[PDB]
Amino acid sequence: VNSFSGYLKLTDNVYIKNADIVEEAKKVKPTVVVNAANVYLKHGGGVAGALNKATNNAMQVESDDYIATNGPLKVGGSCVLSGHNLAKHCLHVVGPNVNKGEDIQLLKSAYENFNQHEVLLAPLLSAGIFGADPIHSLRVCVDTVRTNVYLAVFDKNLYDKLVSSFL
Numbered sequence: 371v372n373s374f375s376g377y378l379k380l381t382d383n384v385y386i387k388n389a390d391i392v393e394e395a396k397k398v399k400p401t402v403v404v405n406a407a408n409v410y411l412k413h414g415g416g417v418a419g420a421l422n423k424a425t426n427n428a429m430q431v432e433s434d435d436y437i438a439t440n441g442p443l444k445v446g447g448s449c450v451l452s453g454h455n456l457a458k459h460c461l462h463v464v465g466p467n468v469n470k471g472e473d474i475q476l477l478k479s480a481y482e483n484f485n486q487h488e489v490l491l492a493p494l495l496s497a498g499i500f501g502a503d504p505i506h507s508l509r510v511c512v513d514t515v516r517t518n519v520y521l522a523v524f525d526k527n528l529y530d531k532l533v534s535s536f537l
Contacts, residue, residue, distance in 0.1 A: 388529035391522035395456035404492035407462035446479030468501030
C-alpha cells in the first residue's frame, strides 16, 4: 500500500489522475517526483518551471551546479537530484521536444529511466509544451514503464480525453 489517492488504474502498474503535480507532490511527498526537464536543466515553464517555483528556485540552483560539473543531459536521458520540499528525489527526465525538432522515438528511451525506480509521481513526457501528442505519450508510458507510475495530468479536459481514448 502507498499514499496516492483518487487515481484511476489503467494497467497493472500505471495509474492516472487530473492533478497539479506540484500540489500532488506537496501532499504525498513521494520518494521520486519526475521533472519534465530539458538537457540544460533550465526550469522555465510547464512542469519544470512549476516544480522549480515551488522549491523557491532551489531546484535551479542545484541544477546549475550539476550542469557546471557534468555538462548537459542527453535527450532521452535523466539524472537524480534532490526533491527539495516536494519529494525525497527528483528524477529529471528529458523527453524529446517536438517544438525543437527531436526524434519522437527517443520518448521510449526517456520513459525507460522510470524503470530504475520502484514508484514515481510523473507527468506525461513530451506532452504539453514539449509538443508531442499526449495520447501517444500515455501509450509509450504503458508499453515501456514496468515500475509503478502515478501520472499527474494537469489539463482537466485532456485527462478526460486520455481516459476515454485509452485502449
